[PDB]
From a paper:
We solved two AKRtyl crystal structures in the purified state. They differ in space group and asymmetric unit with resolution of 2.30 and 2.32 Å, respectively. Each structure contains cofactor NADP(H) carried from E. coli purification and we confirmed that the cofactor is in the oxidized state. The first structure contains a complete octamer in the asymmetric unit in which two subunits are bound with NADP(H) and belong to different tetramers. Of the remaining six NADP(H) free subunits, a long cofactor-binding loop (approximately residues 230–241) are not fully observed in five subunits in the electron density map due to disorder, whereas this region is visible only in one subunit that presents an open state. In addition, a large cleft suitable for NADPH binding was formed above the TIM barrel in all these cofactor-free subunits. Cofactors are indeed bound in this cleft as demonstrated in the two subunits that contain NADP(H). The nicotinamide ring on NADP(H) is π-π stacked against Trp214, and the carboxamide group makes contact with Ser160, Asn161, Gln186, and Trp331 which comes from neighboring subunit’s C-terminal tail loop. To summarize, the eight subunits in the first purified state structure all belong to the active conformations, while the second structure contains half active and half dormant conformations which coincidentally camped based on conformational states to form tetramers. Upon further analysis, in both structures, we found that the dormant tetramers have no NADP(H) bound but the active tetramers bound at least one NADP(H).
Numbering used by the authors:
A (entry chain F): 1 to 231, 242 to 331
B (entry chain D): 0 to 228, 246, 248 to 260, 263 to 331
C (entry chain H): 1 to 231, 235 to 331
D (entry chain B): 1 to 239, 241 to 331
E (entry chain E): 1 to 229, 242 to 331
F (entry chain A): 1 to 54, 56, 58 to 91, 95 to 234, 243 to 331
The structure:
């Protein structure tokens, strides 16, 4: 298994990040524990979850399943870098009660509290914002994170679904008063959606953040979608995206490569990318993700992939000069 | 149903009505207070204002005790409310305080928040407010004491009440020097009869991004139907105000008028019945015409900002 | 009773500070308790003690006597601003085991924990360095004090037996990172010893520290020691050595004669004088009896005339501030 | 016993530092306790240990031996400046599991908690990085140490096996935000290996760190190793490690050393220690007695006064470099 | 001509730095002028000088030659990144009058004004400390350099012959009060002398300084010294043997010693480039060829075994 | 000639400081110039003057100016120190003391008289309790940045003034005071209570003025007994100190004036004494005093005769 520093910090993580979103709604408790044991066996030490995972009435269920996993002992907690998230509404689906979503110091205090209890652990290694909150200023956010840092309840802070300039503002404000800033950004990044390349990834590289790609298969659209319908994806409605996926599936047919694996290995070549979040439901899907991390894509396949799935390049050049 | 706003520049979202709490104890009883709070919650009011001195005399603290009773019932009550209380007041025998048993020394702040947390039956206050400026305590002392509480998780935010504008500036410049969040709100005396917050308090609050909470929004009930059930000048000002020509109830218009003022978060309302609360709710939905605002401005003129209020 | 702000900070204190050094080695526990009750009854809210007080094998006795006073209830702890000290050796008298005296963060951690236990309280209001430690830098000291402030174990930090430039360096270092600095300096200052006037008091005034004067009667020398010489702290220590030096002896003789003539008591005048000195918060009185405490209270109501102030200045000239004190 | 301040800070330490490496592997629990009690009686108040001490499956055994020492009472914990270390892999020897070695905030947090539990104490006086970690930035390290300071789990932070410029960067970063920086550096420094003089000791002195010399006898090569080879007579026929001092350049240095010391009547183990005590900016050497007898010998080396003739001749045998840049440029 | 950034800053410099030490005491005005025009022609934009160059009673002569060169117009001044130095005694050789050497604000002020006058220009681009001064604190030094920056007499500050920790202290002090720190360090670094790798180069890399290698041929000892029979170190059998293995190997691969020593430096991590000291047009052309040379990995490997480096501290002496 | 760093900074100065106050009517312009050339010849590079030196105020600075105008590298070799604070005209408001207004006009008048474009060391002549340091540092920082001055020094400060000044300077990157001129000699040692300990903490040079205590340490009892024309020689106890001092020096064959200067050079943190020779034989006597080595026996005896106070707080408390 390949390891890398998470951006600029001393933390070392697996380039494959185990996502936990399916633990609860798809795989049951014991099945999820087995997948986590097997991720560990393959050397994956980086586990991403969220308070909202579980969905609907079951929000928090994913954290509970990792909690019972840690409760089996055998150094599981000691060995994993535990990441979870704050921002999302934990009450009834629909419009949240005020301050029961987003990034106020008040929601941060109550959110991390409920996460620690469901996770059955006394600390979170990587506490991430699930989305930028334009209404909370960074001196409030860093006050609330710093309370947690100094109680030993969290080690590191990261973001998800930020703009590039939010990364810059967040870390400049942290650095002004001697605080470690964001250590990582979780952005939607895959062959079909490359616009994090304009500004999010350049800002992250500048400020030394790890870049973790969520929806690395674009919701399955890059995992052999077309071949599976012959045996969201309202993209296979639009014939331009459909023809794009077709050329992709055809291209990988002639190089003998699995699309679900190629999509992951492609992200691993991109400058600044720490790795994709993989969400296997079975032992075969985990082993396939591991193979994707050992794949070496030829220049030939990389060039043709860029021809099918062009990227915008960095701003300002992407739209001006 | 209820209108919400950010509290000044910060991430906290509050209802534009602030549930006052001073009646709980003296006027309404524990059972009636509990039921008004349950009602406020169901109308969407999340912002409750209280003070340690509330209850008065030998009953100072009774109000905080009543809110603790309410929280102890469970049912997401503590979780749903932005709880604001106050420090400054003597909690001992009325009359001259023993030294450091009132005002804002780090010593009185330590003893006040401990006694407030115990009576409130909660491990934290969301918004801990100075009841009054203390000219004798410097801001590096006050911010030390508040930072001890912030870092213990005992409080989240700091607000002020009865500050001058320049105290607001000094307090927040001092906090920002060393990374700390400053005052997030100022609770000032603001209503149609008393507009001198407009000279400097409200302008400083808006420059520093504080929410403005208006206490005594009906000027002691003088703006809520007085001569239609104290003087020769005061009466005929109110009489022009209380003149049906436009079809509106005075008490609700005094609240709604404050909601039009730039920088104002909302007023502190103090309902004693669920029907008074339902009126306050409608006050927050009212739209006053450019008509009625221009006329209110001639009955109750305001000073404007300094320096123009008194120079040019 | 007159109250004042302690220097620039919001803490209000009585202009008389109750000293406790006598409680244990010269005044027993029960009468210590009576004096403290009388002090509280007269409006004195500011008590000074030290870990070392008690002396010898009884170092810590004074704190323990304060502890059992608080334990009697009646709001005593809540009403009193409690000050103690760190620096002194709490082990066997003589050369200290390394880091069991002075102001390292290590001695600070162990010293405050033992003080809180002997005082039977969870916080000290005013925690004072007993003496400057030239070997500990201020970033180490402010680290250790800041740990205590953030845990709630102390509120304020003060100094004792500092030079003026130590006050400056300390508070400039604290302010650089937004810490409240020293709030008070407890220095030797009385009619017989006025050299804190050169730099310590000017620096304290500049930086807004309170100034509380220790041994305000010079160990009882200024309390009628000559009249009382054959019948007591004045029979020992500072006072007794001063009485054997003829010039100091003469100074005190002129002092007791001047007060005989004006119908005033020496102990009370010595305290009243300190109360006139600019920047002085108050003297730390050292009653051995309840009588002497009621006497200090009378001192706090005395008004000295210009005539008396000028004659005292003639007997007990002071240097005034540096650089003028020794240059121009 | 001679005391000194540890660099610029208020902490006072004996100029002999009691190393504990041999407690567990070569000395057993009860003799380790007796050595620590005899160190205290000689005035030594400065104990240096490490989480890794113990070796192999027994990593942490040394910290446990100190813990049972402290648990005897008698003001033992109160009298000792306790130092330990973080950086080393505490699991099975070999490649470490990610973040189970080096200086991430994650490993600092788990390493100190495990050391406090083994040491049977609620705080460490001097918590030292065993080695520079080029992959962890100083705002991450200082955040982790600052959490421990503010919780009261540690008092002072030190380094070991740093470059001079790591010392400067660490303490400049700490000073920016009012944090006390490194108070001490533990570098390899002895007659045979003097290259710490180029930049490590200069930087430590500029920034006011104490300098603690580890391996002051260069693994025993300055402790009379050549005489010790010809020691047993017939015992050398036994079925015994190969002799380790083969580099002829260094072997002749050691011969000249032992001859010089024979000429002047001095003990090689004592001189190596006392020499370090003359070097500018050095606090003291770490002494690793395996017996009460070895301790008395180190204590004698602390009271030894080396004549200027012997100091001159030792310098001729073991020349140091200058400070940089002069050592290699001008 | 290969260009690079000078460490972390926006200044772009050729990977060859034109030294001017020989201008005066070896080449005279007219020929140094030709060497400088030819350096411009090959794309070299980075000229290194010093106030002391010229030697003895001719100290300042080199700067005077650059001044007479710039006075010929033709965009010479505009095209060149001009670097000079302060620290050296500019008076009578031997013991210096107090404050007429080293880095006091006193010596800095008189030193830069005399340099500017001799260079015939109103600004120096890169003003370098010739050597660390352990007796002048960095708040004094940065005060003096900041005066020169704000008056527009200098743009960047650099160092020469610092220890690694001096680089760190210098730039941490500058950054605390909003000053650009050192942008480059000039160290003795070549195949024969690699101890800059212990700490100096690693500190420069951490703080983003360019690394300029001076005496890259070790006094000419690496430019074919034994065939063409300070660099007189040849007496020592140990080093003369290094040099013969060196010349022998490059004879076998068909390579010129003076060009390999330069090209080797261009492969070292964090190195900006060597300062070359041509006395003729032939030597400049040679250095240019050196900047174009690609050393194979078996030559770099054999050069390593002949000229081992220490590696970085602490590993170099401990672990 | 012995040199030293001026406190913590990179400036190197001779441990004798040539004062210019005693340039007067027994001292030509021409004889002042000769003395200054002789000082340069002896290796003294540190010249101290003041604007008020000279009702004929500024004349001293003018004499230095014409000295510099002779050329011969005189300006370039000398570390030139002058002062601001004194009235140069009861003073008209802001024509004395340390306001930015008086600093600006004083330095301009000083540079004109001195006939130079810069002062190396510009010193406050006295503490000004009414001007805050952020004002003072603004005005000095303007001069630093214009190149008109290099370093700032103090004179007749309290130790806590030194601390406050340099802490304030360092907050915003500025070089603080580099030197303090204080009254300091065997008879007056109270600068050891706080001034010198602060100066040493903050790394200032200490320049001792009135090093002979107005001549009291220059053999004043011998001169009285020899007959023919401050007086503490009427004070019995102060007289006995000076008598013990002159007896001690007679027994060891040492000159009172020279020993007073040599003693100061042994004191911790002292850069040197100001000397104001009116003749060239007085200068050579000062140079010999800087060469003298006082035995430890003599230094112990001088401490018995002239006990120091110790540092505060120990000086008066414990
Ligand atoms: N920080 C430091 O270094 C020090 C601090 N302190 C603090 O200062 C306090 C006071 O010091 P202390 O030396 O006791 O003070 P004093 O100088 O007042 O000496 C006390 C003695 O003065 C006499 N006395 C006290 N009050 C009166 C009165 N009203 N009328 C007449 N005589 C009186 C009594 O002498 P007699 O018994 O002879 O009648 C008494 O024992 C101490 O309690 C301690 O807290 C003290 C010493 C050092």
């Amino acid at each position: 298994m390949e390891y890398t520093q998470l951006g600029r910090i001393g933390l070392k993580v697996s380039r494959l990040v185990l996502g936990t979103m399916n633990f609860g709604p798809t795989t049951d408790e014991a099945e999820s524990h087995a997948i986590m044991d097997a991720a560990l066996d393959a050397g994956i030490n980086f586990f991403d979850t969220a308070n909202v995972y579980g969905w609907g009435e079951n929000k928090g269920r994913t954290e509970e399943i990792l909690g019972s996993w840690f409760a089996q002992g055998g150094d599981r907690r000691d060995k994993v870098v535990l990441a979870t998230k704050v921002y999302g509404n934990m009450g009834l689906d629909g419009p949240a009660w005020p301050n029961h979503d987003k990034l106020s110091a008040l929601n941060i205090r109550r959110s991390v509290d409920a996460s620690l209890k469901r996770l059955g652990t006394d600390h979170i290694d990587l506490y991430q914002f699930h989305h930028v909150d334009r209404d909370t200023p960074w001196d409030e956010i860093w006050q609330a994170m710093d309370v947690l840092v100094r109680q030993g309840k969290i080690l590191y802070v990261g973001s998800s679904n930020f703009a590039g300039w939010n990364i810059a503002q967040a870390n400049e404000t942290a650095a002004r008063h001697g605080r470690l800033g964001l250590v990582s950004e979780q952005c939607l990044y895959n062959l079909c959606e490359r616009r994090a390349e304009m500004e999010v990834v350049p800002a992250a590289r500048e400020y030394g953040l790890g870049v973790i790609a969520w929806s690395p298969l674009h919701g399955g659209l890059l995992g052999g979608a077309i071949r599976k319908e012959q045996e969201a994806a309202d993209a296979l409605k639009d014939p331009q995206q459909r023809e794009q996926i077709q050329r992709y599936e055809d291209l990988l047919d002639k190089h003998g490569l699995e699309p679900g694996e190629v999509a992951l290995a492609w992200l691993l070549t991109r400058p600044g990318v720490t790795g994709p979040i993989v969400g296997p439901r079975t032992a075969d899907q985990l082993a396939s993700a591991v193979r994707a991390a050992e794949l070496t894509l030829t220049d030939e396949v990389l060039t043709a992939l860029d021809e099918i799935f062009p990227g915008p390049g960095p701003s300002p050049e992407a739209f001006a000069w």
